[PDB]
Amino acid sequence: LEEIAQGLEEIAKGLKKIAWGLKKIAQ
Amino acid sequence: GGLEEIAQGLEEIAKGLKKIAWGLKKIAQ
Amino acid sequence: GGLEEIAQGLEEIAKGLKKIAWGLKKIAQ
Amino acid sequence: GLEEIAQGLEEIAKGLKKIAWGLKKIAQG
Amino acid sequence: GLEEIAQGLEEIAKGLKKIAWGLKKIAQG
Amino acid sequence: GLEEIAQGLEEIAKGLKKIAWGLKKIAQ
Amino acid sequence: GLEEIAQGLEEIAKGLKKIAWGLKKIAQ
Amino acid sequence: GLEEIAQGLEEIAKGLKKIAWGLKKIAQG
């Protein structure tokens, strides 16, 4: 369960990076 | 560098999925 | 060109993987 | 939980279709 | 070759949508 | 809805073949 | 780079296939 | 079924990494 929580956190951080990357692409 | 950041984000998601896979594998005893 | 489409689609995929991940967590619990 | 997974799979499908469009454009220049 | 890959992704997308519909049906149970 | 899941798994396998052949084309 | 992206998407599809099959085996 | 889900997640992780490398290549020209 602890390792699942960490993985869900890493996924959120990655989605944020992708969001910022798409904004940079469109600007 | 927007493409580089999307790449890095995909790697971070990959790492996270692997950790979830490890957790589910433990649930399987 | 098509690079914008690919980047956009990869974000959708990533978002769908997040939902799948949380859905599995809810089932494991 | 199972419904969330399904919604995630549907979002992955949309993302794949967007990627398909990007490749199709690249294929045509 | 890009057109084939695009078509393949589109085909996987439809299969994922069909799988998704199936999970929602089981969820309703 | 087990029949729809089986059909989707088959659609994925079919799509997975088209990607393999497209990769081969690009490889050549 | 396009080749690598295609290969990765092929791998994702294969993994989603395994996930779907597992969920199916769980419901049954 | 839980093990197969974990294996599928791991395979997805591997595919995500390949996509990132392809994005890094395109970003470098």
Numbering used by the authors:
A (entry chain H): 3 to 29
B (entry chain F), C (entry chain G): 1 to 29
D (entry chain E), E (entry chain B), H (entry chain R): 2 to 30
F (entry chain N), G (entry chain I): 2 to 29
Give the published text:
Here we describe efficient routes starting from validated parallel and antiparallel peptide assemblies to design two families of α-helical barrel proteins with central channels that bind small molecules. Computational designs are seeded by the sequences and structures of defined de novo oligomeric barrel-forming peptides, and adjacent helices are connected by loop building. For targets with antiparallel helices, short loops are sufficient. However, targets with parallel helices require longer connectors; namely, an outer layer of helix–turn–helix–turn–helix motifs that are packed onto the barrels.
We solved high-resolution X-ray crystal structures of three peptides using ab initio phasing. Another structure, with g-a-d-e = Gly-Leu-Ile-Ala, had promising solution-phase data for an open hexamer or heptamer, but, interestingly, formed a collapsed antiparallel octamer in the crystal state. Some plasticity in assemblies formed from these types of peptides is expected. Thus, it is possible that Ala-Leu-Ile-Ala and Gly-Leu-Ile-Ala can also access an open conformation in solution.
